[PDB]
Structures are given as structure tokens and as C-alpha cells.
Structure 1
Amino acid sequence: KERTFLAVKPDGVARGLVGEIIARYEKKGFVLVGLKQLVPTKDLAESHYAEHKERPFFGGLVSFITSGPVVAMVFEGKGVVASARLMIGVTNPLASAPGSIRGDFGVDVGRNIIXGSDSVESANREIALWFKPEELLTEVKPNPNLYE
């Protein structure tokens, strides 16, 4: 099925939010097919935020995501891309709804904990960039109580 890329950013890792976030997605029925902790490299970051390189606040994003460990993961299931964003909330955590990750835990735009792919095309780009193919599960077996 479909796949999305998720990164819990350095402020999320530092605040001890990793297991909480993973648990939310496992409980929803999405299946974990990639997971690692790493300190992102400058040129991985610059590729990651590539669509923003002609703007002034490009360097801020890059600087921040390389300042500490990130946990990177990909999950698989039906409509996982749009669903995962709904679960995260909206860009401003102050305006995100109670029950969403940023709604529950976040307070500042620059420290908004986690992000996910914004479309299926982005996700395929992002997944291939952060993860070598031997790091990803080929055979997925989900609960038969989940799909009809």
C-alpha cells in the first residue's frame, strides 16, 4: 500500500516525545517499514528542504535540523499520507486541535516537533533520500482485522 515519510525533529527528540508519537501511529493500524536515529548531514538537509532554497529563511531550517538527532521513519497503509498530516495538525501548533500531536504538545512554529510528506510524490522523493532500499521492509503483514 501507500507510504509516507515522517521525521521527528530535534526538539521532539530532546523533549522525549518519540515513543508517544510512534505509539499513536501503531494504534491507528499503520505499519512501520523504516526507522532510524541519525544526525542529519548538511547536504542531506539541503536536499530535503530543496523546494525552499531561493527564500531567505532556507538556512534557518537547515541549521536547525542538523543541530541534533532526528528519528526518521516511514509507515505504510491506506491513505497514510493525508491521514498522517491530519494526525500531526496544522503549521501553527497554537491553532492545531486538541488530540493532534502539535495541538497537544506544541507552542511555536519553529519548534513544531514532527513533520510528514505533503503528497505522494513528495513522499517517494523523501523516502528514497533518507533510506537505502535494504533498510525498508519488502514484505508487510498487517492485522486482518484492519482491512476488508
Structure 2
Amino acid sequence: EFMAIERTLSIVKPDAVSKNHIGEIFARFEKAGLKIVATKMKHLSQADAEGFYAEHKERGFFGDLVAFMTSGPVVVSVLEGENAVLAHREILGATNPKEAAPGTIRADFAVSIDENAAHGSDSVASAEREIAYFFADNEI
């Protein structure tokens, strides 16, 4: 092979979970060569959401963020493949559905940046943190 095989965290956010887009979104991962090496549907508690987005507790958007990310069940998943992080974010599209490319998850399943269907790790380093927060290594 050619690119390092990486692991990245996926969260199908509550909007997309309530609109039954899990399989569809999953399929797009799989189609693009990413493998699902862990996954679980979870109802986040406030403490769950806060702890995960701890890095932004002092931020303006934090409160609304936490309320949304706990408004309904999410699916957290670990994807794995060559160049996983960057290639995940390419399937998702820009964080803002307005700015996102055609045929991306953010373009087809999300309307606003407040509720953008999916979370992807933006870095290998954060992917390591973000993955370790939701999954024991045994669980993968």
C-alpha cells in the first residue's frame, strides 16, 4: 500500500438518526473504502456531550451544541482505511451544508451548520482522542 492506514471517529448526529439515514450514510463510508471497525447507537447525556466537546466549554455556541447533540440518539462509529481522517471528511463535505459539495453527506442530509448530519475527526491526533473517549480499545 501507499498511505498509512488510519482510524477516525464518526457520529451520525441526532437529526440524521431521526430521519433514518444511518444505513445510507454508512454505505457511503463503506463504498469509499472505509471499514466500520466499531459502532454503537447511543443516547448522549449532557455530561456525555460536554465531556466530548470539553475543548469548547467557554465558547458561545457550546450550550446549543450540547442541547442538540443530546436531543436524540446518535450513532458513534470508528472508521478505518487508508488516509481515513482526510477521506472521511471528504465524504462528509464542508462542516457548513451551504458550502458543501454535491453528493456529500452534509449536502444531502443536512440544512444548517447547527445540525449538519455528521461529525468527523478533523485530525489524526483528535481522532485518537475522540475515539478513545467513546470506545475502549477492546471494543474495536
| TM-score bracket for this pair, using the shorter chain length | over 0.9
Structure 2 match to 1:57? 61
Q: How many residues align?
A: 136
Once residues 72 and 109 of structure 2 are traced to their aligned partners in structure 1, the CA distance between those partners, rounded to angstroms, is: 19
Alpha-carbon contact 1:4-1:120 (below 8 Å) kept = yes
Determine the C-alpha separation between the residues in 1 that align with 2:109 and 2:70: 22
1:100 pairs, out of 104, 109, 122, with 104
Structure 1: segments with no counterpart, 5+ residues: 137-148
Residue 30 (structure 1) shift: 1.4
SS in 2 for 1:97: coil
Residues 9, 70 of structure 1: 8 Å contact kept: yes
State TM-score, norm by structure 1.
0.87
Map 1:25-104 to 2 at 5 A: 25-104=29-108
Segments of structure 2 that go 5 or more residues without pairing to the other structure are none
Amino acid at match of 1:15: K
Larger-Rg structure: 1
Does the CA contact (< 8 Å) of 2:42 and 2:73 recur in 1? yes
Q: What is the one-letter code of the residue matched to 1:78?
A: E
Per-residue CA deviations over 1:40-69 (Å, capped at 9, x if unaligned) read: 122221121111111122111111111110
Query: 1:85-106: per-residue Cα shift (whole Å, max 9, x none)?
Result: 1110112202211111111222
**1:8-23 → structure 2 map (5 Å cutoff):** 8-23=12-27
What is the rounded CA distance, in whole Å, between the counterparts of 1:129 and 1:53 in structure 2? 17
Q: Secondary structure at the match of 1:77?
A: strand
TM-score, length of structure 2 as denominator length: 0.92
AA aligned to 1:44 is: D
Runs of 4+ deviating beyond 2 Å: none
| 1:54 partner letter | E
